[PDB]
């Protein structure tokens, strides 16, 4: 029953299993491969990017901080340096706090990934992000944002990554 | 089992037309089955891309 | 150990097939009905599923309702056959 | 003939307004969008400096 992956590091098996009963039929019985780690590749964003170009399929982004909080998104699109907004409304922000809470589109505006050179982020509404990540991946702010109304995905709004994983399915 | 998709203007709101063939194919007759089907306010481009689409 | 997975991605992948043509079918009713009808866009559609045996008798009815209009039918038509086992 | 003429000029004008309408929406939805990537990323680059200064 819980899904095949190709190795694993900040995901315990009852992170998968209930990761795993959540994600969309589209990539329901595939394998996971690990697109991206910062323990496996280096820390860095241009890395992160230069290893999520050849993509064409959904992700999974898991983030450790450094207070050992995951959280992170299921995002229908490869993180990518983009002009404006991109994604659809299957996009989900997650965290386990301890206990595992899901936040699915509200249907209010479609802000759902956004790539800069020197940033990664999800969601909008004035100047909230649901997920905001530097460019060296050491830095992160998360708050509530009205594309998926989360709560913090972090023990604390201003957070530092302890390591983080891009998952695809593939 | 087969349906038919079909689409007609509203004669004045559109609910008068639905009424109007309700009436005529399963009140009266018993032909048919039917119901409204939703379809939401798309984009319509322009004229030379809409004869490319059909 | 193929088979159990094998018959649930049928299942799960026939499920997004069948929901993306039915998309596509509205797509198709609303871009006929705007180029075939008034750009104010204002038209009501309509699924029927007719009874055995009542074709013809519900064809006439149909072209009786919508003449003032003007294969070829006065109202957009598709069908969705929903037979596929043949 | 002329008749003709009057729903190709009804069609032709009909497409110009709601074209309009499309531009205007689109634009109107790029400037909001544009203001929350545009206010997000200036109030986040300025709030980590003050973050490290302190």
Not at chain 1, 98 to 106: H, L
Not at chain 2, 21 to 32: G, I
Not at chain 4, 2 to 17: C, G, L, S, Y
Not at chain 4, 37 to 48: C, D
Request: hydrophobic share 40%; proline share 3%.
């Amino acid at each position: 029953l819980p899904i095949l992956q190709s190795h694993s590091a900040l995901l315990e098996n009852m992170h998968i299993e209930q990761l795993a009963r959540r994600l969309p039929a589209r990539v329901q019985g595939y394998p996971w491969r690990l697109a991206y780690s910062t323990l496996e590749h280096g820390t860095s964003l241009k890395t992160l990017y230069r290893k999520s170009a050849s993509l064409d399929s959904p992700v999974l982004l898991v983030i450790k901080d450094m207070d050992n909080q995951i959280f992170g998104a299921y995002a229908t699109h490869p993180f990518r340096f983009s002009d404006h907004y991109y994604g659809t409304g299957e996009t989900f922000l997650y965290t386990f706090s301890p206990n595992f809470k899901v936040f699915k589109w509200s249907g209010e505006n479609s802000y759902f990934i956004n790539g800069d050179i020197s940033s990664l982020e999800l969601g909008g509404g004035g100047g909230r992000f649901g997920l905001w990540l530097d460019a060296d991946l050491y830095h992160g702010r998360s708050n509530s944002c009205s594309t998926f109304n989360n709560d913090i995905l972090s023990k604390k709004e201003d957070f530092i990554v302890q390591d983080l994983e891009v998952w695809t399915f593939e | 089992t087969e349906f038919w998709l079909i689409s007609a203007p509203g004669e004045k709101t559109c609910q008068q037309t639905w009424e109007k063939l309700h009436a005529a194919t399963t009140k009266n007759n018993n032909l048919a089955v039917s119901s409204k089907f939703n379809i939401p306010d798309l984009k319509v481009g322009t004229l030379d891309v809409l004869v490319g689409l059909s | 150990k193929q088979f159990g997975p094998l018959v649930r991605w049928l299942k799960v992948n026939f499920s997004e097939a069948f929901i993306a043509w039915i998309h596509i079918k509205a797509l198709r009713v609303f871009v006929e009905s705007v180029l075939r009808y008034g750009l104010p866009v204002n038209f009501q559609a309509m699924l029927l599923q007719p009874n055995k045996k009542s074709v013809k008798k519900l064809r006439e009815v149909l072209h009786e309702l919508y003449k003032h209009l003007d294969e070829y039918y006065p109202y957009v038509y598709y069908k969705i056959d929903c037979n596929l086992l043949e | 003939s002329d008749a003709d003429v009057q729903k190709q000029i009804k069609h032709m004008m009909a497409f110009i307004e709601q074209e309009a309408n499309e531009k205007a929406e689109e634009i109107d939805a790029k400037a909001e969008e544009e203001f929350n990537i545009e206010k997000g990323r200036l109030v986040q680059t300025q709030r980590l400096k003050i973050m490290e200064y302190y």
